[PDB]
Each structure stands twice: as structure tokens, then as C-alpha cells.
Design a protein around this ligand. Structure first.
Ligand code: 4YS
Length: 167
């Protein structure tokens, strides 16, 4: 049993809810929240900007030190950093950004990072300002992630479309 509430069950391991990810993390304090990161960990907008704002910029400060030491992530890659006030850990995952011309095949590689964690609160990778089709992102998630993933979808309209169209 876990603390996640109000989710619709899509599969054995994937759950979905219309929820503000900042507000869901604050309520649950999950072991892992996933950030929709870029390779520079520049958390300016979307999931990354909202999560970072909720940490009072402490996520960005920590991220800048990580990049100064390690250099940029790979598209499809990830790193584990603090969850600050939102979670124990934040898994920063880089999905491909279609608005930069990145290979959508890298979306499966991105979701494979989730398999290193037994339970996660996450957004749909490469959705929103990353430009991918969220219906596609949900299909890749279901077909790639084997661990237990609780997906928060910001747009009620999109949430209802993801559920209604789910195979
Ligand atoms: O701006 C946001 N606040 C809280 C959640 C969120 C999720 C996706 C994109 C933007 C936001």
C-alpha cells in the first residue's frame, strides 16, 4: 500500500491523475519525483520551472553545482539529486525536445531511467513545452516502465483525452 490517492489505474503498474505535480509532491512527499529536465538542468519553464519555483530556487542552485562538476546530461539520460521540500529525491530525466529537433526514439531511453526506482511520481516525458504528442508519451511509458509510476497531468482537458483514448 502507498499514499497516492485519486489515481485511475491504467495497467498493473501505471496510474494517472489530473493533478498539479508541485501540489501532489507537497502532499505525498514521495521517495522520487521526476523532473522534466533539459541537459543543462536549466529549470526555466514547464514542470522544471514549476518544481524549481516550489523549492525557492534551491533545485537550480544544486543543479548548477552538479553541471559545473559533471557537465551536461545526455538526451535520454538522468541524474538523481535532492527532492528538497517536495520529495526525498528528484530524478531529473531528459526526454527529447521536439521544439529542438531531438530524436523521439530517445523517449523510450528516457523512460527506462524510471525502472531504477520502485515507485515514482512523474509527468509525461517530452509533453508540454517539449513538443511531443502526450498520447504517444503515455504509450511509451506503459510499454517501457515496469516499476510503479503515478503520472500527474496538469491539463484537465488533456487528462480526459489521455484516459478516453487509452488502449
Ligand atoms: O506551472 C506549472 N505549475 C505546476 C505544475 C505544472 C506542470 C506542467 C507545466 C507547468 C506547471
Amino acid at each position: 500500500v502507498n499514499s497516492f490517492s485519486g489515481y485511475l489505474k491504467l495497467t498493473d503498474n501505471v496510474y494517472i491523475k489530473n493533478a498539479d505535480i508541485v501540489e501532489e509532491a507537497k502532499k505525498v512527499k514521495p521517495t522520487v519525483v521526476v523532473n522534466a529536465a533539459n541537459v543543462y538542468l536549466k529549470h526555466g519553464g514547464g514542470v522544471a520551472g514549476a518544481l524549481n519555483k516550489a523549492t525557492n530556487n534551491a533545485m537550480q542552485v544544486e543543479s548548477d553545482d552538479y553541471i559545473a562538476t559533471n557537465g551536461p546530461l545526455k538526451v535520454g539520460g538522468s541524474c538523481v539529486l535532492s527532492g528538497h521540500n517536495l520529495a526525498k529525491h528528484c530524478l531529473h530525466v531528459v526526454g527529447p525536445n521536439v521544439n529542438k529537433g531531438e530524436d523521439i526514439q530517445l523517449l523510450k531511453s528516457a523512460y527506462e531511467n524510471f525502472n531504477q526506482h520502485e515507485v515514482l511520481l512523474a509527468p509525461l516525458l517530452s509533453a508540454g513545452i517539449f513538443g511531443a504528442d502526450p498520447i504517444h508519451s503515455l504509450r511509451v511509458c506503459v510499454d517501457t516502465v515496469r516499476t510503479n509510476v503515478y503520472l500527474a497531468v496538469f491539463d484537465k482537458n488533456l487528462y480526459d483525452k489521455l484516459v478516453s483514448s487509452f488502449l
